């Protein structure tokens, strides 16, 4: 169990360092989305790592109902904002490249992304709380009828994974097709740009999918079926945690530390 806390601590430190660096460097249109995603991931890591560490280490919850509900609600809000911001960047790139060439529209899309986070945040908060067994106290769910649990988990997985993932895949496929169709004329710059764009799209899609699959898959497994109480299940669950946190930590790495504009800005500051 010591490895659990040390891995969470290292991932938290790496993610907070990277996201803080990106926010400081940023202090256009894609930069707005990068800042929003970095803010979302910073909020996610800050509101997730210590509390899940305490849950997996301490025997009982020791921070009360207010902290329990507040932390879990902003956990869900930050996760949803991050995923929707990734989808927004992909559709933004599709619009910019396919319709070759809006701050107000970007702000409307953002504000909008936070509004959507909130519906899903509402469910985490409302139905979360401190349970008293038949003594001690704990922080987990409070759901009267399992039907609403199953529906909410299925809805959040379907929306907040399929819609951004499919949107990202479709938009990047369209931009790749547009590059391969409009720049079919051979030249060194064209081939280098096509190679770099293929690399970046491949990295983004693979990282997003592989990172965010285990969390939703284990939640669906909990809804449909049960976890067998085995050490292997514990390693599987912590692997899901670590992949979600790794996504929240390396999104700045694969989204700003690779872009040439942000690289120049970082070298400046």
């Amino acid at each position: 169990n010591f490895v659990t806390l040390v891995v969470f601590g290292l991932i938290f430190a790496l993610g907070v360092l990277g996201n803080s660096l990106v926010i400081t460097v940023l202090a256009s249109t894609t930069n707005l989305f990068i800042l929003n995603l970095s803010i979302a991931d910073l909020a996610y890591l800050l509101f997730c790592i210590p509390f899940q560490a305490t849950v997996y280490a301490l025997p009982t919850w020791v921070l009360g109902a207010f902290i329990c509900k507040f932390i879990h609600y902003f956990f869900t809000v930050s996760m949803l904002v991050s995923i929707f911001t990734l989808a927004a960047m992909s559709v933004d790139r599709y619009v910019a490249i396919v319709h070759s060439r809006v701050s107000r529209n970007a702000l409307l899309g953002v504000g909008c992304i936070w509004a959507l986070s909130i519906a899903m945040a509402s469910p985490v908060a409302y139905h979360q709380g401190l349970f008293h067994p038949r003594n001690q106290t704990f922080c987990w769910e409070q759901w009267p009828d399992p039907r609403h649990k199953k529906a909410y988990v299925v809805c959040t997985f379907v929306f907040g994974y399929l819609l951004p993932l499919l949107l990202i895949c479709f938009c990047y496929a369209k931009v790749l097709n547009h590059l391969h169709k409009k720049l079919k004329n051979m030249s060194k710059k064209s081939e280098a740009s096509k190679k770099k764009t293929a690399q970046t799209v491949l990295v983004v899609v693979v990282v997003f999918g592989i990172s965010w699959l285990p969390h939703h898959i284990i939640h669906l497994w909990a809804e449909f079926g049960v976890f067998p109480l085995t050490p292997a299940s514990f390693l599987f669950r912590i692997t899901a945690h670590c992949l979600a946190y790794s996504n929240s930590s390396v999104n700045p790495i694969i989204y700003a530390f690779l872009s040439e504009n942000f690289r120049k800005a970082y070298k400046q500051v």
Partner: peptide, 17 residues
């Protein structure tokens, strides 16, 4: 390993009992 806190975090109140 699997403690009561972590098990109740996932399964839920009635399921962990």
């Amino acid at each position: 390993g699997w403690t009561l806190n972590s098990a109740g975090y996932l399964l839920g109140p009635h399921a962990v009992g």
